[PDB]
Tab-separated table of C-alpha atoms and ligand atoms in Angstrom:
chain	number	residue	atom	x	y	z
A	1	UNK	CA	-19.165	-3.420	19.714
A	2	UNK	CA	-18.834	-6.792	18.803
A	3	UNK	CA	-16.097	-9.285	19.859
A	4	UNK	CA	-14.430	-12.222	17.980
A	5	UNK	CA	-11.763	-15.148	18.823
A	6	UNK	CA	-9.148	-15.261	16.310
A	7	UNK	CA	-8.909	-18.761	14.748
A	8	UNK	CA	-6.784	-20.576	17.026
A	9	UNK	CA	-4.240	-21.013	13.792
A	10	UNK	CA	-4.249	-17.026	13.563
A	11	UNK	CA	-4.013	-17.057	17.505
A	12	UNK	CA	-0.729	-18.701	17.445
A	13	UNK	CA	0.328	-17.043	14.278
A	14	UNK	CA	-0.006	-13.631	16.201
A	15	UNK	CA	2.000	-15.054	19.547
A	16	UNK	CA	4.844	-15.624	17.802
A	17	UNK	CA	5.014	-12.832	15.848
A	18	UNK	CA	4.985	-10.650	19.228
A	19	UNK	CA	7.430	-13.046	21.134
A	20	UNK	CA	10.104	-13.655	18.363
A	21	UNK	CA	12.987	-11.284	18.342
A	22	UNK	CA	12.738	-10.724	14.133
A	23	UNK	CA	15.617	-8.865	13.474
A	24	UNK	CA	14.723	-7.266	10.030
A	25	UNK	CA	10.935	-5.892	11.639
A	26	UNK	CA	11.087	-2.874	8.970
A	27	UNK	CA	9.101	-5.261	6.789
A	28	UNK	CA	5.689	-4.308	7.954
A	29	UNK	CA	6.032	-1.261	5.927
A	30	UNK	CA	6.986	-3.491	2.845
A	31	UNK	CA	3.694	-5.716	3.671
A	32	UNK	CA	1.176	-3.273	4.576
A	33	UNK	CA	2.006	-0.979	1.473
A	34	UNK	CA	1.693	-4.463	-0.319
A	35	UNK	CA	-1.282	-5.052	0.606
A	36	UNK	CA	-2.691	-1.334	0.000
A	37	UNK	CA	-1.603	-2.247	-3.859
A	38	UNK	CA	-2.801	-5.190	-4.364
A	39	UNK	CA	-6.382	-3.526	-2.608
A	40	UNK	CA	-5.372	-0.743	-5.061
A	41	UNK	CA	-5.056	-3.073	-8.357
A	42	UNK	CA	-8.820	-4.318	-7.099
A	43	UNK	CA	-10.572	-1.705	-7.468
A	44	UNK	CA	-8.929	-0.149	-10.482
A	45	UNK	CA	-9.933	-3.646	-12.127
A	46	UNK	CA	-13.573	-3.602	-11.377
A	47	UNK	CA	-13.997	0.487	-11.806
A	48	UNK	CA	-13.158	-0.903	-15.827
A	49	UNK	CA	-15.989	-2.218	-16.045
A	50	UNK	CA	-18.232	-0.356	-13.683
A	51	UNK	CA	-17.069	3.276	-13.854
A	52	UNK	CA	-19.522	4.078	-10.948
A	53	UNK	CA	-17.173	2.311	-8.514
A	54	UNK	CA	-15.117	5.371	-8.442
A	55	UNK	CA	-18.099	7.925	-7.126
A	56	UNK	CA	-16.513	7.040	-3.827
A	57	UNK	CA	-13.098	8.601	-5.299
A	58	UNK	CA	-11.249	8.209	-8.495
A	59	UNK	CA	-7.899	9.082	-7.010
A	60	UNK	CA	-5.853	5.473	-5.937
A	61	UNK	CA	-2.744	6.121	-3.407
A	62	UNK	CA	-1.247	5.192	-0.481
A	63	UNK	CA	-0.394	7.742	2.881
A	64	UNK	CA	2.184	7.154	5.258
A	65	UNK	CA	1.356	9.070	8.453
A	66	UNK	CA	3.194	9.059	11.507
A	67	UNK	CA	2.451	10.733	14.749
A	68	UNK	CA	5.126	10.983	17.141
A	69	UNK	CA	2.523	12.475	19.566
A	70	UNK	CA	0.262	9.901	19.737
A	71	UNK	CA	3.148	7.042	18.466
A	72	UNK	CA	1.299	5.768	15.456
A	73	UNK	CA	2.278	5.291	12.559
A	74	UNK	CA	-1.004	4.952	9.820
A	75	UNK	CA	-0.887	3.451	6.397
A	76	UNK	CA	-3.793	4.296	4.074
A	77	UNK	CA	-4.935	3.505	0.727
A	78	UNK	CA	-8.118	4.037	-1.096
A	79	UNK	CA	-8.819	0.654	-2.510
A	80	UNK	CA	-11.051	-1.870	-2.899
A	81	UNK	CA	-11.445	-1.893	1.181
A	82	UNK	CA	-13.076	-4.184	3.327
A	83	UNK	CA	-16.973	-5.026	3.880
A	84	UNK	CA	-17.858	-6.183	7.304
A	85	UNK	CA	-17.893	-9.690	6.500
A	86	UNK	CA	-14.670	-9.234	4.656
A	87	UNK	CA	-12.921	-7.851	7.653
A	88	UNK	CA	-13.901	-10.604	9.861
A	89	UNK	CA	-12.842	-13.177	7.256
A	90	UNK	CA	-9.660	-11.965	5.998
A	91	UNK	CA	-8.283	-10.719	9.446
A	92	UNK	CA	-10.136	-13.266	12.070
A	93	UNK	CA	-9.566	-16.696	10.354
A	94	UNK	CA	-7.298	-18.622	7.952
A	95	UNK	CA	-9.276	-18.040	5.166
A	96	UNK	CA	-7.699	-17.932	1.829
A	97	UNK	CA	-4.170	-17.423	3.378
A	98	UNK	CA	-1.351	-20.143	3.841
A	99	UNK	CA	-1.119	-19.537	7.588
A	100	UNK	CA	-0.816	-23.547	8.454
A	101	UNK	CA	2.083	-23.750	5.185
A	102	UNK	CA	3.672	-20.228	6.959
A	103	UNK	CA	4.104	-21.605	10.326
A	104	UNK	CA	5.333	-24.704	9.019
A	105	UNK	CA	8.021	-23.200	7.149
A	106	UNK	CA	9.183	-21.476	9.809
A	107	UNK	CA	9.431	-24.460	12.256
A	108	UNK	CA	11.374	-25.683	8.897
A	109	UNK	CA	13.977	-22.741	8.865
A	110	UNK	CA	11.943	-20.387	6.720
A	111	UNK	CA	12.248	-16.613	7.412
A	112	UNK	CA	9.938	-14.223	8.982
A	113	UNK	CA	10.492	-11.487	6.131
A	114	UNK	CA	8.692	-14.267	3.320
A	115	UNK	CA	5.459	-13.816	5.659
A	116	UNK	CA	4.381	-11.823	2.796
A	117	UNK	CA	4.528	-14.627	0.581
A	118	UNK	CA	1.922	-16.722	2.179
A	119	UNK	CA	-1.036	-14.256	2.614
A	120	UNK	CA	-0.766	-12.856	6.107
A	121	UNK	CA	1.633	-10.289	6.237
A	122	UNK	CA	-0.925	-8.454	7.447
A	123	UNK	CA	0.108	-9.757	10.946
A	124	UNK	CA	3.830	-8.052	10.664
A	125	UNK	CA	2.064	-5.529	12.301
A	126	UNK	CA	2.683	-6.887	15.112
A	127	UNK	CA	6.478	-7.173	14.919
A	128	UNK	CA	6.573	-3.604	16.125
A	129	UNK	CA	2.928	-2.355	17.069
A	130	UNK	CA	1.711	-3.074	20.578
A	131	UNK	CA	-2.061	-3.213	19.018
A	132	UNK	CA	-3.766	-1.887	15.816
A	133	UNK	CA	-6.857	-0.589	14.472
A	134	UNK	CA	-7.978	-1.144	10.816
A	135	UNK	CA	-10.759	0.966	9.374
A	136	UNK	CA	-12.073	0.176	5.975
A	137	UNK	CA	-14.730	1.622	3.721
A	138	UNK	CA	-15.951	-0.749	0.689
A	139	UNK	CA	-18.510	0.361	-1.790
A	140	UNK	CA	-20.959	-2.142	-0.475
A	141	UNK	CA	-20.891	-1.708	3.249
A	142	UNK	CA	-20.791	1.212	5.833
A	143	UNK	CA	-17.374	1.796	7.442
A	144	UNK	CA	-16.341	-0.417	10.190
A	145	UNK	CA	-13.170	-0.084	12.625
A	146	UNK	CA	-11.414	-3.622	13.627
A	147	UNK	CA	-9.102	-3.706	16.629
A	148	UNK	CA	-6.773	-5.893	18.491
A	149	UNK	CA	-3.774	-5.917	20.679
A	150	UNK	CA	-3.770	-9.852	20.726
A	151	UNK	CA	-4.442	-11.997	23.168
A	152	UNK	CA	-6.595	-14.141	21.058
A	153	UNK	CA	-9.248	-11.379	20.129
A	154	UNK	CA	-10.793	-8.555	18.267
A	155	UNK	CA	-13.229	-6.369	17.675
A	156	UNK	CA	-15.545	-4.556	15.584
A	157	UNK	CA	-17.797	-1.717	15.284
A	158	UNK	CA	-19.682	0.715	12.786
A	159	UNK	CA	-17.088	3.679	12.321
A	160	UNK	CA	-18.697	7.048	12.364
A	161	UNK	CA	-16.631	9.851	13.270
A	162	UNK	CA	-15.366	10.080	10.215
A	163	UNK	CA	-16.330	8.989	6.598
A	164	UNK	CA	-13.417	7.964	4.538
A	165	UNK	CA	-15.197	7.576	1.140
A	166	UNK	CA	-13.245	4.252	-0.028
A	167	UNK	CA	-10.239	1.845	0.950
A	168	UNK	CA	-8.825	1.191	4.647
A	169	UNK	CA	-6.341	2.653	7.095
A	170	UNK	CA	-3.830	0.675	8.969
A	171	UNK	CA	-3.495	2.194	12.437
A	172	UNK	CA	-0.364	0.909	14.162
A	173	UNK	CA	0.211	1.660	17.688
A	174	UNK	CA	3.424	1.277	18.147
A	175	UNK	CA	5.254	-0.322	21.106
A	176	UNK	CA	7.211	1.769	23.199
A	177	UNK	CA	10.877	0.819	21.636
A	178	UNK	CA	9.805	0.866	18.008
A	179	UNK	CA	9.321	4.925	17.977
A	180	UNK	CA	12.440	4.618	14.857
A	181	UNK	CA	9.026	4.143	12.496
A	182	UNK	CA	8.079	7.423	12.944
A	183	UNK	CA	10.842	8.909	12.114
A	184	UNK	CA	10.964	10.790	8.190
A	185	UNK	CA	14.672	9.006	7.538
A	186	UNK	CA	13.592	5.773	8.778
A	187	UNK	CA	10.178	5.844	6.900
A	188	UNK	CA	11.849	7.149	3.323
A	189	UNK	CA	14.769	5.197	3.570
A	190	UNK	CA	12.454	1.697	4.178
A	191	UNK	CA	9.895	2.317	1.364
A	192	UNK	CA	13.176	3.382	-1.065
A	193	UNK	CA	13.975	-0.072	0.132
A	194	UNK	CA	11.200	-2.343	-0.226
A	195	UNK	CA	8.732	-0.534	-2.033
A	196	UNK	CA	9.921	1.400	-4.720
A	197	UNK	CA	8.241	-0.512	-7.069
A	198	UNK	CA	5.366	0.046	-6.317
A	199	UNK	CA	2.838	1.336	-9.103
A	200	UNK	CA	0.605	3.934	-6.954
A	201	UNK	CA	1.695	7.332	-5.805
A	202	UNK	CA	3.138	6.874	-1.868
A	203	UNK	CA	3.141	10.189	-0.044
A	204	UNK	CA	4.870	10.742	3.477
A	205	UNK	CA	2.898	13.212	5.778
A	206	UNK	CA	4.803	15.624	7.794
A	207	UNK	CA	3.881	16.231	11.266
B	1	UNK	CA	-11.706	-22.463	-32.409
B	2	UNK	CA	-11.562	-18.652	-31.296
B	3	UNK	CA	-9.029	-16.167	-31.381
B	4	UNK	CA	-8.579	-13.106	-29.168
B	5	UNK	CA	-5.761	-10.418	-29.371
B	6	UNK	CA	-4.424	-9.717	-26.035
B	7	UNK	CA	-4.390	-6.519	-24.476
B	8	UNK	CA	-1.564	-3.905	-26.067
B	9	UNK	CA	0.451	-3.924	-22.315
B	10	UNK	CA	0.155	-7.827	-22.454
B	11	UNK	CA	1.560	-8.461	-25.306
B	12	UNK	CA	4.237	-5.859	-24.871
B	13	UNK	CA	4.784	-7.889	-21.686
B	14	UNK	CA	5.274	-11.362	-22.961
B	15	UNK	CA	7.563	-9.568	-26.069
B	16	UNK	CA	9.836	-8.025	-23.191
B	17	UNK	CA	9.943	-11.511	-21.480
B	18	UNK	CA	10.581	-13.558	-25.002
B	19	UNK	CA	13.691	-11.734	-26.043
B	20	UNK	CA	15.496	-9.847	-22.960
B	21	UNK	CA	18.336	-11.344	-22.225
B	22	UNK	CA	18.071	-13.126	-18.453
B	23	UNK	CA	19.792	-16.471	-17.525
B	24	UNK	CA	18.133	-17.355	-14.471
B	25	UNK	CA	14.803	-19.098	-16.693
B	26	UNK	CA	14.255	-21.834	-13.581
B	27	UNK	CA	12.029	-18.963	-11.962
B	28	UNK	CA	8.814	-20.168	-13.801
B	29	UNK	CA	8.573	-22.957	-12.202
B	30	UNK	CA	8.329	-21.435	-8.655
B	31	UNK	CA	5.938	-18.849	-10.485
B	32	UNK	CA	3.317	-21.453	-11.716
B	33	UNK	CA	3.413	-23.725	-8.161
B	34	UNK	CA	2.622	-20.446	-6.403
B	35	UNK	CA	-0.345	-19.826	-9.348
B	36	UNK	CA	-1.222	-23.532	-8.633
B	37	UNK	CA	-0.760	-23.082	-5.269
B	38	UNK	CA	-2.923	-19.572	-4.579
B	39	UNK	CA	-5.279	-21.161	-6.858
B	40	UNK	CA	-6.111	-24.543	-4.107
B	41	UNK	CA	-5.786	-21.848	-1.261
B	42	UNK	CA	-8.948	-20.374	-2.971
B	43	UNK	CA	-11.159	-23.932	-3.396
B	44	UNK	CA	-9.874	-24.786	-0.154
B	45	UNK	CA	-11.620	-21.300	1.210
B	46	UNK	CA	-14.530	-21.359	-0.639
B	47	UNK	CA	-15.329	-25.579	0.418
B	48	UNK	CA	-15.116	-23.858	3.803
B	49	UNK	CA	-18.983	-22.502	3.521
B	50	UNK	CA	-20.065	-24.864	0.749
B	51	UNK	CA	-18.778	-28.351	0.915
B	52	UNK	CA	-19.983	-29.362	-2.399
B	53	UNK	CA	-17.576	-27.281	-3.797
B	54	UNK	CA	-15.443	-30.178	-3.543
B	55	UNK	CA	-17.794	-32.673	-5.322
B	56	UNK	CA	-15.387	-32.101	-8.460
B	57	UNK	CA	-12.664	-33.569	-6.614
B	58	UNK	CA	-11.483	-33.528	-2.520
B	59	UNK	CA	-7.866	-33.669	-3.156
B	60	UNK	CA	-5.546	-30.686	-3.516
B	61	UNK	CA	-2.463	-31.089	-4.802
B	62	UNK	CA	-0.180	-29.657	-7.243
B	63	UNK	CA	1.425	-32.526	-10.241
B	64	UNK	CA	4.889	-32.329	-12.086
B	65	UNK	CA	4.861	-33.489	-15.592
B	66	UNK	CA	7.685	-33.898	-17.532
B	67	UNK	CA	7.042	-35.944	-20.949
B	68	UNK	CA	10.631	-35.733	-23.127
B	69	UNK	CA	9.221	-37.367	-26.195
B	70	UNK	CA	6.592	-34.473	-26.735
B	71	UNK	CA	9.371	-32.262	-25.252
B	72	UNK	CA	6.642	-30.565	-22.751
B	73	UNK	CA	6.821	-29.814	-18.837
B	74	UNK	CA	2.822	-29.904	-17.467
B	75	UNK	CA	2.260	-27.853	-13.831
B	76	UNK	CA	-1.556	-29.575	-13.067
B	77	UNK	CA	-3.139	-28.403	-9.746
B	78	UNK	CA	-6.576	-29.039	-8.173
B	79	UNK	CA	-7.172	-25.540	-7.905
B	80	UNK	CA	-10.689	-23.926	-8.363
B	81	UNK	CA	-10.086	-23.574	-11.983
B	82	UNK	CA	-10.395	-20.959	-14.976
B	83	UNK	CA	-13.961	-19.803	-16.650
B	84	UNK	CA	-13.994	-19.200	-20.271
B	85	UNK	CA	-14.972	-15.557	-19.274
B	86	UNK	CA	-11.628	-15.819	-16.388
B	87	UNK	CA	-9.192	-17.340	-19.292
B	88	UNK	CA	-9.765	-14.322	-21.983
B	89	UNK	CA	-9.741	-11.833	-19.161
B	90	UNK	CA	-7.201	-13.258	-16.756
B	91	UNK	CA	-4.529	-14.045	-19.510
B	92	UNK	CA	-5.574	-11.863	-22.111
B	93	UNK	CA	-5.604	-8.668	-20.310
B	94	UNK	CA	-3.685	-6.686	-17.645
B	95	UNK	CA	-7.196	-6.840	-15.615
B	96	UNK	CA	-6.114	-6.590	-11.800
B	97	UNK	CA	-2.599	-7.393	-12.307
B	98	UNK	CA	0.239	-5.437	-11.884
B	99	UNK	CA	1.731	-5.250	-15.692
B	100	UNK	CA	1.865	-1.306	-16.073
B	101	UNK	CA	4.096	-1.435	-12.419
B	102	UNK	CA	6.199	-4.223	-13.900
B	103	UNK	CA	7.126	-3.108	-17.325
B	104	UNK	CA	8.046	0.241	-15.529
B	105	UNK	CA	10.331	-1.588	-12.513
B	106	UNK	CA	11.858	-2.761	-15.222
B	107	UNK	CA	13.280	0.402	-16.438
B	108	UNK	CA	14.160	1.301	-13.489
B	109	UNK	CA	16.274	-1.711	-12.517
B	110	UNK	CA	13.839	-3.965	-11.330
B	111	UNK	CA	14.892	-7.654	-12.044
B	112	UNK	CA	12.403	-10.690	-14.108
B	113	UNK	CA	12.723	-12.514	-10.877
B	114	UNK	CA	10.354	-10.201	-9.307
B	115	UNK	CA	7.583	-10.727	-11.932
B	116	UNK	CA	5.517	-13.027	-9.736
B	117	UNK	CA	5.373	-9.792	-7.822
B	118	UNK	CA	3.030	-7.784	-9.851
B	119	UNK	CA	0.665	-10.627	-10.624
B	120	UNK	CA	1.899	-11.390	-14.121
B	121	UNK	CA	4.403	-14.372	-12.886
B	122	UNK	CA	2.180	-16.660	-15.549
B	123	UNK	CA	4.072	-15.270	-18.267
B	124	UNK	CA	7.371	-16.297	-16.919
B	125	UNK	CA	6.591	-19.361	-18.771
B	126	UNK	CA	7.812	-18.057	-21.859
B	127	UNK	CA	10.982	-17.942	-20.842
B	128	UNK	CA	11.133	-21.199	-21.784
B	129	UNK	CA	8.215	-22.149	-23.448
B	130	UNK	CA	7.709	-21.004	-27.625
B	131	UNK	CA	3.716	-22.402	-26.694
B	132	UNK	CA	1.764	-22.579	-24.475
B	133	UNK	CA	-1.559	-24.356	-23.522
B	134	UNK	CA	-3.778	-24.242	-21.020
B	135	UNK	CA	-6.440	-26.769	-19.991
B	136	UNK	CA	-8.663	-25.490	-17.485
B	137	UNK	CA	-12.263	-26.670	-15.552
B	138	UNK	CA	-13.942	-24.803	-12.949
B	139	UNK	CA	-17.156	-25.631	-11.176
B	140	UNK	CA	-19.190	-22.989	-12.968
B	141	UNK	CA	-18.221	-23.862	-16.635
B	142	UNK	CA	-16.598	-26.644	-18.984
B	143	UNK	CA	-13.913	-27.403	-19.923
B	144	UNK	CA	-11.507	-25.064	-22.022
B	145	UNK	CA	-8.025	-24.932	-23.862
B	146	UNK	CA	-6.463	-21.427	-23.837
B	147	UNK	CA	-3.619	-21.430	-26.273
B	148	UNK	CA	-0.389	-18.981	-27.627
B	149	UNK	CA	2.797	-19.180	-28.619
B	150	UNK	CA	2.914	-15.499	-28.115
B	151	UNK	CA	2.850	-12.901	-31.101
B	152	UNK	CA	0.001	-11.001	-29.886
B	153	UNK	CA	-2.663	-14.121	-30.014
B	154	UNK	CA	-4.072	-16.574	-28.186
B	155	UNK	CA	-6.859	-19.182	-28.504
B	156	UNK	CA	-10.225	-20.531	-27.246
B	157	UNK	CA	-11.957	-23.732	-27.195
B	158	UNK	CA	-13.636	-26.529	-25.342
B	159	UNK	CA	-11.412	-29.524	-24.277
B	160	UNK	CA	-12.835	-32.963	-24.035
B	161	UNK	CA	-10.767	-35.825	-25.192
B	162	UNK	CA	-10.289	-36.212	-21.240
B	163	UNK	CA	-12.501	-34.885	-18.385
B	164	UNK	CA	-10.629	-33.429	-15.634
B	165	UNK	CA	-12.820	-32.593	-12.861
B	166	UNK	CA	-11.651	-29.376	-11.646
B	167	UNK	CA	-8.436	-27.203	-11.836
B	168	UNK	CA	-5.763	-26.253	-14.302
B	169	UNK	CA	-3.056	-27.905	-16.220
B	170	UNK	CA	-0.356	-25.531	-17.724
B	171	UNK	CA	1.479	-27.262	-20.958
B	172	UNK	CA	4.456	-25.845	-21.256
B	173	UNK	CA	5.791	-26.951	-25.280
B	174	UNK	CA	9.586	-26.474	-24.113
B	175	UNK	CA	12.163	-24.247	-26.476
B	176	UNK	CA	14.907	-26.744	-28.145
B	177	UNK	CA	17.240	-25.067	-26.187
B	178	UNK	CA	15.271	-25.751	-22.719
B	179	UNK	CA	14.664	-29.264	-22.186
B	180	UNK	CA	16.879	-29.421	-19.214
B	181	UNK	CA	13.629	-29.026	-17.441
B	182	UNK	CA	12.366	-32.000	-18.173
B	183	UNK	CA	15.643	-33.713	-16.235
B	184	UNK	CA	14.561	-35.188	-13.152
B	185	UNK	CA	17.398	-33.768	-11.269
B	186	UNK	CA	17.072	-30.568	-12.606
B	187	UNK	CA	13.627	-30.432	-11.401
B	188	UNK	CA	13.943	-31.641	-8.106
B	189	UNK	CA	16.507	-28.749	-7.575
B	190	UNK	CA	14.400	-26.076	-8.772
B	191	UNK	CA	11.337	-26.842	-6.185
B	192	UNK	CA	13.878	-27.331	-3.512
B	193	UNK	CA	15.434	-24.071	-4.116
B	194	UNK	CA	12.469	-22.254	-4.856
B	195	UNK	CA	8.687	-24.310	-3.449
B	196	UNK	CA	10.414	-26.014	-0.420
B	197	UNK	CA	7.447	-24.258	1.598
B	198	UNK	CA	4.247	-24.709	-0.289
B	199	UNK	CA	1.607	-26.641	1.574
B	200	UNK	CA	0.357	-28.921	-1.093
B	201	UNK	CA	1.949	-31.667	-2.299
B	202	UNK	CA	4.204	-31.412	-5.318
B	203	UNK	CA	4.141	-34.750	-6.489
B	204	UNK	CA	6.856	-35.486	-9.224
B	205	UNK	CA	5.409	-37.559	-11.964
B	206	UNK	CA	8.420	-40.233	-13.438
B	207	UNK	CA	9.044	-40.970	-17.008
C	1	LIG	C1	-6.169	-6.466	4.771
C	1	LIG	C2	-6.417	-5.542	3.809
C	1	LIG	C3	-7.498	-5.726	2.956
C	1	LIG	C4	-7.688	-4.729	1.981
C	1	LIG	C5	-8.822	-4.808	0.979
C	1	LIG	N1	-9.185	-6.188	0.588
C	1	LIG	S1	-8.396	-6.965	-0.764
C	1	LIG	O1	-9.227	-8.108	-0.981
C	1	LIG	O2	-8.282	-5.976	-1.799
C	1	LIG	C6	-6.855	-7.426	-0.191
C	1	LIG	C7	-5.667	-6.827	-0.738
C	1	LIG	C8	-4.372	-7.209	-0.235
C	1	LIG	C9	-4.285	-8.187	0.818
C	1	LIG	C10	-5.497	-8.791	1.369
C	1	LIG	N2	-5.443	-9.723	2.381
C	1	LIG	C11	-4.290	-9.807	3.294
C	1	LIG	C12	-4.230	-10.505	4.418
C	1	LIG	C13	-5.175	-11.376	5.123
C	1	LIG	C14	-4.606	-11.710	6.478
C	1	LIG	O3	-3.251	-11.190	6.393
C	1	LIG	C15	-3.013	-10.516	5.247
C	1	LIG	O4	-1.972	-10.009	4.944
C	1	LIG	C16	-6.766	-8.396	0.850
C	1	LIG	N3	-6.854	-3.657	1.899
C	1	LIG	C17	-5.846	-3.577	2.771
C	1	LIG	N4	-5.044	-2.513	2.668
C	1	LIG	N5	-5.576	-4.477	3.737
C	2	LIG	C1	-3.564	-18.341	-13.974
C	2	LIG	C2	-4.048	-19.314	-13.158
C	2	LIG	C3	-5.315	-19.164	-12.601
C	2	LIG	C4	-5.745	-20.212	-11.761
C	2	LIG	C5	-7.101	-20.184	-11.072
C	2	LIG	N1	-7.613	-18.832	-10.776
C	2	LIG	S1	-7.211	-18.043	-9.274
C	2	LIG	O1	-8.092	-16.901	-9.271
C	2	LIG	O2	-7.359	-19.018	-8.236
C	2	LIG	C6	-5.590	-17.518	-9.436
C	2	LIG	C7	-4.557	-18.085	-8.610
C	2	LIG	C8	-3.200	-17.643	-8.767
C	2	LIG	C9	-2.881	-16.640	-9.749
C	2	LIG	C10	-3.928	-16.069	-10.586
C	2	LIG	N2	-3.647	-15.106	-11.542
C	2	LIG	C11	-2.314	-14.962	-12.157
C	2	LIG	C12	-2.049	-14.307	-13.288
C	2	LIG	C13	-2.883	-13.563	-14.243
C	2	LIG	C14	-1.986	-12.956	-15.298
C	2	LIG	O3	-0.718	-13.611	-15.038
C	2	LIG	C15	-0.685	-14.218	-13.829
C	2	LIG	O4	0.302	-14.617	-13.288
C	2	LIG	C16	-5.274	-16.520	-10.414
C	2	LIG	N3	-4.953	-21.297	-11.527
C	2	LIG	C17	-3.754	-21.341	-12.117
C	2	LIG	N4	-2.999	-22.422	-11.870
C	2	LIG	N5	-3.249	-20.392	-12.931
């Protein structure tokens, strides 16, 4: 088990994501499933050209599964996913995202919900889980599970319970007064909402 | 001089965005900032871990051209730049982008706003463009001019009259009908409505 500090830019990103009172905090769905696409849209790209990519699984979705039991709510995909390094440098540090230009624009009036817009909406998460875990499987690498509940750090570890062939799933544990995510109106009517565009199959698990 | 036939979907893309009727053209401008602007977010990244990544040129910045005797509009950014092998691919083909999802959102109500969306916003430039050209220069390969004026073709070939380090300058060869973005005022409104939060400067060139 290894453990990292965020960038202090991602640090403060996260801080006031969990002390702002957001309104309109259905939006994680919007951003997670975003990001499962675009992770989606990967993978189908480079399988063109290497048809091998898919031994790992051919099929290219997105779950929603919620757990009232043990209050999560999981979002999974079988993309592109996330080698070790990958998950360390896309959810530890600035990276290739517009954190700095984010929290700017908010200072400047900008709204929470255009998060998405500036690479890290990743961090929504937050606007209504207490912590979350984040295990990937890329074609490269061996599966690793990431996990934080803020407070300026993370971790990582090899994942070995259970092999997941390709892509990454979004654990979020929710906080005790966000329990409406887990909920089958809730859920349909939000991704009717923000993500009916989307151009990969999005099934809802029943519990 | 080479020319390429894009891919079926692509063309059928750009023919959807030539003649469908939509008003609200000013969108490809906040389309080709946040290209320009994803594009520095990526040379910025990769400088992190090797600083001579930046020998091509330090500043990042995105340039507004507007030239009313040629009748063009010119986005230039200090981005990290096209390949030969990126230009054919990127704009020739669907490739990672989201044009199947796109064309289909569109039959189902989706709006041409949302293009950027899907990864196809480049496009958006015909909406007020009949040509155009592309000048491109990434580290890893010279310089290049990618060319259409739509109708299922585009061109290939080095650029040299004028070296410009690194990055990529969109020439958009405005419709008769469209030069009111090459108004000063017209401009000026379009990134404050639209790029007001981009964190690179959008420097407005004068006539
Ligand atoms: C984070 C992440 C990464 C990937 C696979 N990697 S990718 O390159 O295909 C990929 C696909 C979509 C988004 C990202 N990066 C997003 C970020 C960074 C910080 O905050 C964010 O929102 C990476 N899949 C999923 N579902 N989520
Ligand atoms: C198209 C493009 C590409 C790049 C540099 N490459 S990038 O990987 O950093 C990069 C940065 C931002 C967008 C893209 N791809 C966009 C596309 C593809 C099809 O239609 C689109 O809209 C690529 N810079 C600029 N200014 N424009």
């Amino acid at each position: 088990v290894e453990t990292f500090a965020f960038q202090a830019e991602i640090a403060q990103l996260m801080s006031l994501i969990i002390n702002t009172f957001y309104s309109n905090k259905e939006i994680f769905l919007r951003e997670l499933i975003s990001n499962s696409s675009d992770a989606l849209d990967k993978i189908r790209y480079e399988s063109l050209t290497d048809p091998s990519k898919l031994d790992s699984g051919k099929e290219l979705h997105i779950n929603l599964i919620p757990n009232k039991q043990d209050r999560t709510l999981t979002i999974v995909d079988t993309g592109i996913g996330m080698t070790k390094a990958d998950l360390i440098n896309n959810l530890g540090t600035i990276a290739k995202s517009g954190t700095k230009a984010f929290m700017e624009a908010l200072q400047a009036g900008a709204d929470i919900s255009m998060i998405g817009q500036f690479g890290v909406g990743f961090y929504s998460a937050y606007l209504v889980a207490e912590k979350v875990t984040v295990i990937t499987k890329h074609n490269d690498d061996e599966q690793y599970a990431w996990e934080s509940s803020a407070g300026g750090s993370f971790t990582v570890r090899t994942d070995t319970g259970e092999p997941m062939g390709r892509g990454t799933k979004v654990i979020l544990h929710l906080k005790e007064d966000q329990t409406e995510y887990l909920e089958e109106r809730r859920i349909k009517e939000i991704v009717k909402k923000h993500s009916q565009f989307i151009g990969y199959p999005i099934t809802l698990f029943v519990e």
